[PDB]
Design a protein around this ligand. Structure first.
Ligand code: PLM
Lengths: 283, 129, 235, 68, 267, 235, 68, 68, 235
């Protein structure tokens, strides 16, 4: 019955003592942290506490969106040699770092994801030609569905794939997706593999990546400029922001201390130096 | 803190160029004008150079203007100090100085007062060997 | 339609927003949760757990297992500190990397009481007494048993009960303190000294180490969410 | 189907015949059928850190000896 | 009254009993006792295999040695029990399964010996690899050493053999082999075998995963990390040694999807 | 007008949306429906209907009526499989084109139990016994009566009751499986073997065929709607 | 003339004094006169597949012989 | 959870069967959970300037002599 | 969606607006207030406090402590004014810098009664009588005891009760007056004269000064908020 925004217990008055009750002395080897308050070691006063842990609840700690990726698409001229650029991006929280580490304070989590889509666009060729406001379609291609090969193939028809139609110059695009995990919670660390290499099988036939599984395959996001070829090329970037609302977490882990190196837990040489210099006898 | 780690102790003759640098990689309320202080064992500690974190507010001590210039790398994060035409009067231990909240070096402009993270110290001698 | 009026802020995107939005996959059969042991409700409860402090951060010891060790000896009594520590939980190197601190790095204000627990890891035949001291800021940082003895302190006896906790009570001018290294919101000084000295018999290792842990008390809180600086992505 | 909740008032307006004192509440209305669409209520609960702090089989009496 | 103490303990699982006189109580991970899979939480339809005493008893691994230059030691579960009597057999023949464990590490010395050992149970102990060329590159064989387990190192060594890489872990001790300071390791259920006080560490771990049951052959749910927090010293000698031993016992052992024998390539 | 504020997502078009909109033909007299027999409520009930599996998909037999036929013979007993099949209902060629699978191709996750029914279409004078086997994944895919016999299996007697059903029970690590061919979400192996052998008298066709059907059980479900890849438009 | 319906809660917010537990409902209001304008309620019904699975004239007892 | 308040009518419309006379009220609805988001009620209170004007220990009787 | 219509004013930003908006830091634990003595409810109560008037604003005296002093002498009686003052609280130099006026500079309209208190700061042995006068506007500004005596006025005796207050009652054509110097909204004239003369014995300072204060009465009000001109930023 203790809510997140409720006041923490008041610190009460305590005078002098001298007996056989031992608050100060314990043993950490047992694995238990001594749950002491100030009155156990010092003489304190009656104090009506007012502060609350309202701002540190799991909900509140993650109550923010974070740039997860930056996608790049364009609309060049018809006379072009290289094909119009369409972006494909696999849905992961692990391309960026900030959000990842927060998520990584825990081993498992349940949340409904809210995604926002900020879109930028610019001219690239130093000309004086013109472009007409663009519309961008962000289709969600789940694992299994056909992933576009052309900016103009049959996939972009979207009969069952969720797709967003964003007009440039308006409110950034935002959708919601429920807990879509194949497991009962999203796993942030997997201590295993996908395949089991068997004795009577070729090593090649039995290999898989360490810590890699379907637990994390959510398909890709495909985007293009709906507009047809324009005489003067226009570049555009869609910045995606993920907010894990309605969140639940399990098993606390120490936070990443060394800069990340790939989607795994691996680290590289010369990055393994997080702490600076500080002498033992100085403040 | 920020990281402040300085080096560059070359005992050049009177009239040579020397470069001093102090690390400021981590980005706290970052070294505004920064700061360079020299302690002459005859005198004491004194302020010398300083360019604002972002802005071009570089203050120069009366004794070092023109000869001594301050500049840094707004990316590689380290603070350079070009000290040319060195007199024998500039033989002292130099120190870098982080002045956090930029206003610390806007109000007073110069460092000294709004400076919380102290550097290590490099001995520079400018003599007639 | 119903006459409406657009007020400032319309069309903007504040990342700290909290509104409803259309669903991308309607009628999706969400998988029910299962009782996974060890769920956490708030960040502070992680803070209350005792984590080991990388004390000696010398050029040689930093970034090595040894930084967690604080060597003690059977040298005759001296009034010199064993270790000096500043009450800047979120900004002083030694405290900055402990869970407590790391957590603090996600907030801007910190308030409440803290506790320092020390673990003697010498032999059973080793005996000794120490004085762990916490001095509120404003005066000369302690450097000799004498001044430290004037502040808040626990005198610890080395015995069968392996560890000792000193509680640094919340004594502040402000209602909340800054996660940054700052004078106005300075926290004070933490210091350990030999009360007697370490005593061992013959055929007993003359030098030993001590482990230190720090955590928050049931009335510790933080506010103002910000991004940490102990993590970064280059390009 | 409105959801009216309370606001823990921080700063107070020199008001108590409108704002300030007399319990200030807010309204919320769910517009979508899917729970995934809803905003974060933020009306959460706390717990006892024990499962992390005192994961010991035997009861810890802080005043008594840890080892006995 | 009767002299009952938290240091003196005896635990019994099957036809095996452990006894000690220098304990530091006992830890039950996250406050949860191991349990059988509930109907409300179940998923595979087939009637499950509950071996009981057959699999659920204490199992002693191969003893290792603690000296001044040891950097640490590690093991994974179930992995570290893959070849232990019935349990292992039951593991190799069923597609899925779940289990809890009571891990008991042993290591006594003398009142003249010193040192502290951190015994940490890390759910999903995904360790770091050895290459700076390829990530998540450690092979199954090297990942799962079984009962012998593995060790931590004090210096990262990147494999530069691009022809036939080593494909193993290179777990740095201070970063608890995962890129996170060992100091915070205490966030995980743990105990400390500090020679002065205690000779053992006992931890009870329930089954922990993102799902009710999983393929134990493909996935390890818990890791066992033991690192000397304080160094091992004795009197005034230069190279002392004290053995460390781990006995592990599954608890509430159950398995489903019985089929033909799994013969994995372990080498 | 009523002061209003535009929040993110305004003006966008999500194809998965569900809102009201103005009508193009107001007051249109819609024609009432009539009881047309055979209305369907959900896609899964189509899934529960048994459809024939195009087993043998050899170069010669594929895309021909023959792919539905599995030839059996009166050859002396052998421990070799008659047919091998992987539990990837939505991704393995042989299962991929059955209604069940085709349906599965419209979703991303699949869960629940499945049933395999086999139809002996030889002569009445023909007798025999077989072993249809389902082995959960993780081990060596069965290839001899022996290992298959260790898994889930029905031993079928050829007689007056023409068909036999083997139920592949839902045995999975995950709550839901992937419509794609994947290791983590692997389903297992389906296999048929001769128990005895096919026996016929004289003046009786020595070789015959068998038909196979697969469908979902009352507790089969799918989620995450996606576009199929078994259909496409070129230009 | 509002239409308030329920939401089958999937993921739960650590809330039950607002969200999470205590039945979360949504509101819907029809703005147009024509039924064709309305949004999809999605509150549908299931049936028994029999008309496709067991379209047999005589009752099928799964435990008995199909042919008797 | 609407907040209906009164309006101190200044100029009056030649109306009292709608506007003008019969107490004209306004409605307000809090849309956000945080008090910091709310608009200013403006329904404030006055006080006695004494604490600034007569900060004297002894009671000041304006008709009597200040110094007595 | 609900059919809506945009009415004029949409999207605009009026600085005088009052609406709700999304919060930048949700769930921030605001620090509760403490009883800080001396809280103010409204600007007028500051106005009711008596502040000293910088009367003599001559080239020599202006911007110096002396501008607050009004020198009196024991010169034989004269009918000439000691000081002349215009009732333009918010616009006449002498009144313009008093708290009252300064406050008035934040508004456009001012209404109600005002009070002028005068403090004799000569010796105890000094005696005298004066006539402080307030004449409503419209006629010849007083310059001799005679005409001033015809208006509102208090005749003050110098004695043990050190100060005297003259209340300038609210006498206006308009309901509210202009903060500007204006004829239509003119306030009138304030004037002090010697009734008798200042008398002192021997060995007593023949010349002394007087202090003057002005404040609002319990029924003083202001309206129409505007920016002041007594403050500015150059570039
Ligand atoms: C058109 C809108 C797109 C709708 C589909 C979104 C796909 C769901 C992906 C959610 C998982 C994202 C991965 C992060 C979760 C994690 O931290 O493990």
């Amino acid at each position: 019955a203790a809510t997140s925004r409720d006041a923490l217990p008041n610190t009460e008055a305590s005078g002098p003592t001298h007996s056989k009750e031992i608050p100060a002395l314990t043993a950490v080897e047992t694995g238990a942290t001594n749950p002491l308050v100030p009155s156990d070691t010092v003489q304190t006063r009656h104090v009506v506490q007012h502060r609350s842990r309202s701002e540190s609840s799991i909900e509140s700690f993650f109550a923010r969106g974070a740039c997860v990726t930056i996608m790049t698409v364009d609309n060049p001229a018809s006379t072009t040699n290289k094909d119009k650029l369409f972006a494909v991006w696999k849905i992961t929280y692990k391309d960026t770092v900030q959000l990842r580490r927060k998520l990584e304070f825990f081993t498992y989590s349940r949340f409904d994801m809210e995604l926002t889509f900020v879109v930028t666009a610019n001219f690239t060729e130093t000309n004086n030609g013109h472009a007409l406001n663009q519309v961008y379609q962000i289709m969600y291609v789940p694992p299994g569905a056909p992933v576009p090969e052309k900016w103009d193939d049959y996939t972009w028809q979207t009969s069952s794939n969720p797709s967003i139609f964003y007009t440039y110059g308006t409110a950034p695009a935002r959708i919601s997706v429920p807990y879509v995990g194949i497991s009962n919670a999203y796993s942030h660390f997997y201590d295993g593999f996908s395949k089991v290499p068997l004795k009577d099988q070729s090593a090649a036939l039995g290999d898989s990546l360490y810590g890699a599984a379907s637990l994390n395959d959510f398909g890709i996001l495909a985007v293009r400029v709906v507009n047809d070829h324009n005489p003067t090329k226009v570049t555009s970037k869609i910045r995606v922001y993920l907010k894990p609302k309605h969140i639940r977490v399990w098993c606390p882990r120490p936070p990443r201390a060394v800069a990340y190196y790939g989607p795994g837990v691996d680290y590289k040489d010369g990055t393994l130096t997080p702490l600076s210099t500080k002498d033992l006898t100085t403040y | 803190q920020v990281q402040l780690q300085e080096s560059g102790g070359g005992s050049v003759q009177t009239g040579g160029s020397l470069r001093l640098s102090c690390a400021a990689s981590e980005y706290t309320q970052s070294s505004a004008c920064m700061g360079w202080f020299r302690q002459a064992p005859g005198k004491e500690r004194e302020g010398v150079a300083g360019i604002s974190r972002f802005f071009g507010t570089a203050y120069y001590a009366d004794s070092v203007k023109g000869r001594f210039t301050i500049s840094q790398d707004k990316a590689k994060n380290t603070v350079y100090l070009q000290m040319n035409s060195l007199k024998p009067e500039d033989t002292a231990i130099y120190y870098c100085a982080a002045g956090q909240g930029c206003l610390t070096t806007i109000q007073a402009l110069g460092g000294a007062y709004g400076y919380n993270a102290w550097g290590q110290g490099t001995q520079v001698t400018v003599s007639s060997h | 339609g119903l006459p409406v009026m657009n007020t400032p802020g319309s069309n903007q995107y504040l990342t700290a927003d909290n509104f409803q939005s259309p669903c991308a996959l309607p009628e999706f059969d969400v998988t029910p949760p299962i009782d996974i042991p060890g769920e956490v409700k708030n960040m502070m409860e992680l803070a209350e757990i005792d984590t080991m402090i990388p004390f000696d951060l010398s050029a040689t010891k930093k970034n090595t297992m040894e930084m967690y060790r604080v060597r003690l000896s059977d040298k005759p009594h001296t009034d010199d500190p064993i270790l000096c520590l500043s009450l800047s939980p979120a900004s002083d190197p030694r405290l900055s990397h402990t869970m407590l601190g790391e957590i603090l790095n996600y907030y801007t204000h910190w308030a409440g009481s803290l506790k320092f627990t020390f673990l003697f890891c010498g032999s059973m035949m080793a005996t000794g007494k120490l004085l762990v001291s916490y001095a509120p800021p404003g005066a000369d940082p302690p450097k000799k048993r004498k001044e430290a003895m004037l502040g808040t302190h626990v005198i610890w006896d080395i015995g069968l009960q392996s560890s000792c906790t000193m509680v640094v009570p919340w004594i502040s001018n402000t209602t909340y303190r800054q996660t940054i290294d700052d004078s106005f919101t300075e926290g004070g000084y933490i210091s350990v000294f030999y009360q007697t000295r370490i005593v061992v018999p013959l055929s007993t290792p003359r030098e030993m180490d001590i482990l230190g842990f720090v955590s928050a008390c049931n009335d510790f809180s933080v506010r103002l969410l910000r991004d940490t600086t102990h993590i970064e992505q280059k390009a | 189907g409105a959801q009216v909740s309370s606001q823990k008032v921080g700063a107070h307006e020199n008001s108590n015949r409108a704002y300030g004192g007399s319990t200030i509440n807010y309204t919320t209305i769910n517009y979508y059928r899917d729970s995934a669409s809803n905003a974060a209520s933020k009306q959460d609960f706390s717990q006892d850190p024990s499962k992390f702090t005192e994961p010991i089989k035997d009861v810890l009496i802080k005043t008594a000896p840890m080892l006995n | 009254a009767c002299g009952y103490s938290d240091r003196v303990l005896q635990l019994t699982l099957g036809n095996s009993t452990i006894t000690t006189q220098e304990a530091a109580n006992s830890v039950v991970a996250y406050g949860r006792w191991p349990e059988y899979l509930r109907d409300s939480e179940a998923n595979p339809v087939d009637q499950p295999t509950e071996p009981d005493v057959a699999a659920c008893r204490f199992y002693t691994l191969d003893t290792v040695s603690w000296t001044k230059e040891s950097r640490g030691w590690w093991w994974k579960l179930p992995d570290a029990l893959r070849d232990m009597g019935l349990f292992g057999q039951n593991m190799y023949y069923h597609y899925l399964g779940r289990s809890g464990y009571t891990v008991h590490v042993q290591c006594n010395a003398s009142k003249f010996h010193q040192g502290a050992l951190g015994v940490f149970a890390v759910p999903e102990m995904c360790l770091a690899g050895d290459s700076n060329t390829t990530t998540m590159h450690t092979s199954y064989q090297n990942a799962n050493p079984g009962e012998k387990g593995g060790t931590f190192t004090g210096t990262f060594t990147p494999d530069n053999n691009q022809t036939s890489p080593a494909r193993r872990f290179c777990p740095v001790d201070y970063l608890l082999g995962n890129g996170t300071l060992l100091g915070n390791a205490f966030v995980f259920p743990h105990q400390i075998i500090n020679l002065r006080t205690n000779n053992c560490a006992t931890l009870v771990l329930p089954y922990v995963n993102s799902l009710s049951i999983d393929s134990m052959v493909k996935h390890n749910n818990w890791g066992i990390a033991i690192l000397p927090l304080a160094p091992l010293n004795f009197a005034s000698e230069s190279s002392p040694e004290i053995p460390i031993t781990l006995t592990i016992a599954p608890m509430c052992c159950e398995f489903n999807g019985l089929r033909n024998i799994t013969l994995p390539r372990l080498q």
